Amino acid sequence: FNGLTVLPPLLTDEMIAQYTSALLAGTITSGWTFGAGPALQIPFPMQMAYRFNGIGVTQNVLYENQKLIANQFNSAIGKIQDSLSSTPSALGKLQDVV
Amino acid sequence: YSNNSIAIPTNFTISVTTEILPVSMTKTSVDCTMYICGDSTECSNLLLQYGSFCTQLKRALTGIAVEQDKNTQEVFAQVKQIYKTPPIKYFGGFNFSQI
Amino acid sequence: QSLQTYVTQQLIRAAEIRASANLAATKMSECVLGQSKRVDFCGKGYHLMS
Amino acid sequence: YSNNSIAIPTNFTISVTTEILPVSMTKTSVDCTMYICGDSTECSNLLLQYGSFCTQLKRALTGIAVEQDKNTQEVFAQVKQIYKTPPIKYFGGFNFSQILPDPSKPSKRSPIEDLLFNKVTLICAQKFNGLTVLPPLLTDEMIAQYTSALLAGTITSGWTFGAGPALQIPFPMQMAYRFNGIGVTQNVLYENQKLIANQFNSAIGKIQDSLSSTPSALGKLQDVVNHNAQALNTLVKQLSSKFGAISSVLNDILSRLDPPEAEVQIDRLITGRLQSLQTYVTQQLIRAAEIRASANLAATKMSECVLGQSKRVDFCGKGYHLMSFPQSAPHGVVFLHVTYVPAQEKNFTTAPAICHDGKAHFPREGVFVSNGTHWFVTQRNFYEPQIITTDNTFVSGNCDVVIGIVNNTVYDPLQPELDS
Amino acid sequence: AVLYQGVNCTEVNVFQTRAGCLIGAEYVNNSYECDIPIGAGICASYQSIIAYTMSLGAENSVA
Ligand SMILES: *[C@@H]1O[C@H](CO)[C@@H](O[C@@H]2O[C@H](CO)[C@@H](O)[C@H](O)[C@H]2NC(C)=O)[C@H](O)[C@H]1NC(C)=O
Numbered sequence: 001f002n003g004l005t006v007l008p009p010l011l012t013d014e015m016i017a018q019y020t021s022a023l024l025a026g027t028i029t030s031g032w033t034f035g036a037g038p039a040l041q042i043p044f045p046m047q048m049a050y051r052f053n054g055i056g057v058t059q060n061v062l063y064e065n066q067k068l069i070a071n072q073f074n075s076a077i078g079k080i081q082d083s084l085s086s087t088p089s090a091l092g093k094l095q096d097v098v
Numbered sequence: 099y100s101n102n103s104i105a106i107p108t109n110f111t112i113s114v115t116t117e118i119l120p121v122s123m124t125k126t127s128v129d130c131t132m133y134i135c136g137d138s139t140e141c142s143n144l145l146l147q148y149g150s151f152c153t154q155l156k157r158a159l160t161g162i163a164v165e166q167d168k169n170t171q172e173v174f175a176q177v178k179q180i181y182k183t184p185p186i187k188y189f190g191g192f193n194f195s196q197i
Numbered sequence: 198q199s200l201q202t203y204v205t206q207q208l209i210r211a212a213e214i215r216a217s218a219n220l221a222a223t224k225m226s227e228c229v230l231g232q233s234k235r236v237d238f239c240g241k242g243y244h245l246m247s
Numbered sequence: 248y249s250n251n252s253i254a255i256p257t258n259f260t261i262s263v264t265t266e267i268l269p270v271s272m273t274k275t276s277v278d279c280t281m282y283i284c285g286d287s288t289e290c291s292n293l294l295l296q297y298g299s300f301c302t303q304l305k306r307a308l309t310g311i312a313v314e315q316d317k318n319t320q321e322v323f324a325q326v327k328q329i330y331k332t333p334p335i336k337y338f339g340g341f342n343f344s345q346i347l348p349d350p351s352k353p354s355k356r357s358p359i360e361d362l363l364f365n366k367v368t369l370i371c372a373q374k375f376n377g378l379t380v381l382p383p384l385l386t387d388e389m390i391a392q393y394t395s396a397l398l399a400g401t402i403t404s405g406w407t408f409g410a411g412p413a414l415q416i417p418f419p420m421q422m423a424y425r426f427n428g429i430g431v432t433q434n435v436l437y438e439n440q441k442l443i444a445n446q447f448n449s450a451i452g453k454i455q456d457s458l459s460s461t462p463s464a465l466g467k468l469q470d471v472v473n474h475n476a477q478a479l480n481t482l483v484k485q486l487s488s489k490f491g492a493i494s495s496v497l498n499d500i501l502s503r504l505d506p507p508e509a510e511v512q513i514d515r516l517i518t519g520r521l522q523s524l525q526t527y528v529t530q531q532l533i534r535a536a537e538i539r540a541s542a543n544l545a546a547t548k549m550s551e552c553v554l555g556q557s558k559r560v561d562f563c564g565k566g567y568h569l570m571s572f573p574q575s576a577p578h579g580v581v582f583l584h585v586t587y588v589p590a591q592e593k594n595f596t597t598a599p600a601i602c603h604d605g606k607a608h609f610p611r612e613g614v615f616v617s618n619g620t621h622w623f624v625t626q627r628n629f630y631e632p633q634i635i636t637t638d639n640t641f642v643s644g645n646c647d648v649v650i651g652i653v654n655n656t657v658y659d660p661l662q663p664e665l666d667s
Numbered sequence: 668a669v670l671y672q673g674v675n676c677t678e679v680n681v682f683q684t685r686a687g688c689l690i691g692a693e694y695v696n697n698s699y700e701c702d703i704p705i706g707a708g709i710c711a712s713y714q715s716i717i718a719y720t721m722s723l724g725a726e727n728s729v730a
């Protein structure tokens with residue numbers, strides 16, 4: 001009413017989601033290479049072996065326990081959604097901004 | 099703690115955690131004359147004597163407004179190629195349906 | 198005076214949000230686009246990805 | 248994307264990029280009494296009633312002024328010993344004339360520094376009303392000397408001078424160390440030295456041309472200068488406002504009216520000018536905080552990218568970081584990041600492990616690739632096929648645990664030795 | 668010592684610096700660390716009071 005207006009953002013939510021989807025696809029298919037140059041494909045277990053070597057654990061640890069690691073990752077990904085949904089104070093900062 | 103003893107892990111756990119970070123606030127703009135005086139002409143004439151306060155306020159608000167878009171662009175726009183996932187969503191047992 | 202108070206508060210909050218956005222950009226650059234050796238920067242434990 | 252396919256680079260490119268960071272703003276000082284009142288003494292007596300506002304404003308401005316010098320000292324003065332490049336400017340083909348100081352110029356500045364100085368660009372009116380600007384503690388020549396010392400130290404001694412005494416090292420060997428830093432073996436550089444040097448020189452020339460041919464490259468420092476000048480201009484212009492009085496000039500009010508009403512008129516003028524001064528001080532404080540944050544970022548970048556090699560992604564340029572060079576600019580610093588970028592990738596077929604005699608072999612530092620009929624071990628960042636032996640592979644377990652194992656033979660280097 | 672900021676020395680041990688006019692300090696060709704910053708590369712210290720040009724650091728030529 002009194003001469004105050006809210007201006008729309010330049011980036012709509014759909015294009016931000018598109019950016020996030022592009023980042024997810026890049027990091028899933030090409031590991032860390034796409035951030036430092038052209039994207040080079042790599043099988044996901046091999047990328048997992050690389051990242052295991054990155055922290056000081058040999059590749060055979062990943063290769064001989066692939067199913068267990070996959071199951072643990074899937075269980076954590078399942079748990080995180082319920083953790084976010086069941087707690088109202090998880091999103092405190094953005095709601096505080098609003 | 100001991101003299102010649104260590105503890106070596108024997109088994110592992112994969113953990114997934116969240117981290118929420120605000121990026122941009124709401125871009126807002128104001129009209130100095132309309133807010134302060136409305137449609138009254140005498141009030142506007144009196145307000146003209148104060149000088150360039152409204153210009154300063156408009157400049158600051160415009161700076162904030164452009165800074166918000168700059169923040170969003172810096173945070174998200176970091177790749178100039180729009181990659182696409184393959185049609186077959188199999189990655190060696192890892193399941194990415196939730197993301 | 199009311200308008201000036203509002204503008205100053207907006208400026209301070211904008212500075213805070215800019216600091217947060219810079220931190221978020223650094224996190225995206227380092228934890229997502231690569232593997233980070235910094236402790237507790239990208240989660241508790243030894244970082245794998247994000 | 249696939250699940251038995253990999254892409255390996257076969258060539259590289261040395262890329263140099265620029266990053267501009269503001270460091271310090273203009274040091275300014277104000278005179279509360281002279282600005283608000285001027286030569287009049289009655290106005291000073293009336294202003295004395297309002298308390299200690301002028302003291303607060305002066306203290307805040309002094310704090311900002313000293314903070315600017317602190318920022319510059321933090322960013323640049325990081326080495327307490329100034330180094331000099333050797334007279335013979337030969338570094339194994341690398342050719343640094345565009346960043347080293349130029350003795351011909353009286354100012355002793357590098358050509359890129361000269362271009363940056365030239366590309367960045369009423370005073371009496373501001374000065375005459377109680378507003379002054381203070382000269383920086385460090386002149387431009389001293390900043391250039393600091394940058395030259397840092398550059399000579401990083402050229403002659405690598406990263407060793409940043410963590411203790413400076414130890415000399417031939418430049419190709421330093422490049423080999425920095426190549427080992429990113430996971431590429433030394434023989435690559437020792438065999439492509441000429442190509443790498445040519446690429447580096449071409450990149451430096453392109454950097455100079457790109458900086459010269461674009462006017463919007465240095466927007467941040469110009470924005471700082473424009474902000475300071477515009478704020479000062481607005482503060483000066485605020486003196487012409489009536490602020491509800493009968494005249495905007497104090498002398499006419501004093502010489503036209505009686506004291507009982509002259510006091511009211513000067514009261515209106517005093518409160519208006521006090522509000523203007525407070526607004527200016529607050530804006531300066533906020534801008535100083537932002538500039539301090541930028542200066543801290545610049546100091547961190549100088550400490551980590553210049554005085555060493557950084558593993559952080561995109562912190563010191565796009566790609567795998569190799570090294571960096573500092574240059575001074577009006578109210579800021581310019582970093583030239585030299586980085587390594589893979590190119591000319593190629594398809595290959597890969598396997599996680601090799602099964603041989605019921606034993607699983609995994610690579611030590613490379614990856615298994617196949618060109619269609621034979622299997623080799625290569626580095627991840629550069630294609631260099633090698634015969635699979637027991638030197639580059641290690642054994643763990645049997646062939647049935649892992650998924651995707653591939654049959655092949657593993658050469659024994661000692662087999663011809665004991666056989667002969 | 669007294670420093671008149673932004674004033675030529677002819678409009679007021681007299682020294683003319685880029686910051687202003689300095690009275691009560693003697694200029695010395697020697698260089699030391701900065702003790703009391705004055706500006707434009709000029710610093711003052713007490714040893715009487717002297718004014719000098721600050722030294723960046725010890726010279727070192729790596730072989
Ligand atoms: C390492 O931990 C995982 C779980 O964190 C263990 O996996 C469990 O093993 C038990 C016993 O076989 C099963 O009943 C569970 O179903 C398993 N859980 C999952 C998620 O697979 C694993 O056994 C541990 N390692 C060792 C050597 O015991």
Ligand SMILES: *[C@@H]1O[C@H](CO)[C@@H](O[C@@H]2O[C@H](CO)[C@@H](O)[C@H](O)[C@H]2NC(C)=O)[C@H](O)[C@H]1NC(C)=O
Pocket residue numbers: 078193194195196
């Ligand atoms: C990946 O995860 C999704 C969701 O966690 C799984 O989809 C579930 O499949 C079961 C059995 O078909 C259904 O009962 C659930 O309702 C599904 N969930 C959702 C959210 O739709 C999926 O099976 C998992 N695996 C793969 C390979 O996609």
Ligand SMILES: *[C@@H]1O[C@H](CO)[C@@H](O[C@@H]2O[C@H](CO)[C@@H](O)[C@H](O)[C@H]2NC(C)=O)[C@H](O)[C@H]1NC(C)=O
Pocket residue numbers: 257258259442445446591
């Ligand atoms: C790797 O790339 C470099 C340049 O990017 C190639 O060198 C070029 O070779 C062609 C043909 O021999 C010449 O015309 C160019 O002048 C060379 N460039 C430079 C900068 O000298 C090199 O041949 C490539 N290597 C491979 C194996 O493809």
Ligand SMILES: *[C@@H]1O[C@H](CO)[C@@H](O[C@@H]2O[C@H](CO)[C@@H](O)[C@H](O)[C@H]2NC(C)=O)[C@H](O)[C@H]1NC(C)=O
Pocket residue numbers: 342343344345
């Ligand atoms: C290092 O780079 C400089 C600048 O690119 C080279 O200087 C050029 O040399 C040629 C031939 O002597 C002249 O025609 C150019 O005018 C020079 N450029 C400038 C800007 O003066 C230099 O040759 C390179 N190598 C060495 C060893 O100095």
Ligand SMILES: *[C@@H]1O[C@H](CO)[C@@H](O[C@@H]2O[C@H](CO)[C@@H](O)[C@H](O)[C@H]2NC(C)=O)[C@H](O)[C@H]1NC(C)=O
Pocket residue numbers: 618619620621
């Ligand atoms: C895959 O690479 C291997 C290794 O270079 C190739 O084997 C050699 O091929 C060349 C020419 O094709 C012959 O002259 C050599 O005698 C081969 N060496 C051996 C030990 O056999 C192989 O030909 C390549 N395969 C393809 C399809 O290009």
Ligand SMILES: *[C@@H]1O[C@H](CO)[C@@H](O[C@@H]2O[C@H](CO)[C@@H](O)[C@H](O)[C@H]2NC(C)=O)[C@H](O)[C@H]1NC(C)=O
Pocket residue numbers: 602654
């Ligand atoms: C890799 O080589 C092993 C050993 O030669 C193969 O294992 C044999 O496979 C045949 C046919 O399937 C069986 O009759 C034998 O009993 C297997 N022997 C053992 C010890 O398991 C294996 O099949 C080969 N894999 C591939 C993909 O060719």
Ligand SMILES: *[C@@H]1O[C@H](CO)[C@@H](O[C@@H]2O[C@H](CO)[C@@H](O)[C@H](O)[C@H]2NC(C)=O)[C@H](O)[C@H]1NC(C)=O
Pocket residue numbers: 728729730
């Ligand atoms: C390593 O040897 C070199 C000789 O090439 C030494 O460099 C000389 O050191 C002396 C002693 O300070 C100086 O007076 C000379 O000016 C240096 N020569 C040059 C060309 O600069 C160097 O000091 C030796 N380093 C060690 C640790 O002994």
Ligand SMILES: *[C@@H]1O[C@H](CO)[C@@H](O)[C@H](O)[C@H]1NC(C)=O
Pocket residue numbers: 101
């Ligand atoms: C073991 O501990 C004792 C005392 O707790 C100490 O004197 C001794 O030095 C330790 N062992 C070694 C090898 O130092």
Ligand SMILES: *[C@@H]1O[C@H](CO)[C@@H](O)[C@H](O)[C@H]1NC(C)=O
Pocket residue numbers: 186188249250251
């Ligand atoms: C590998 O990919 C093919 C097709 O993309 C698929 O049919 C096959 O099942 C995958 N490998 C495994 C072990 O699932």
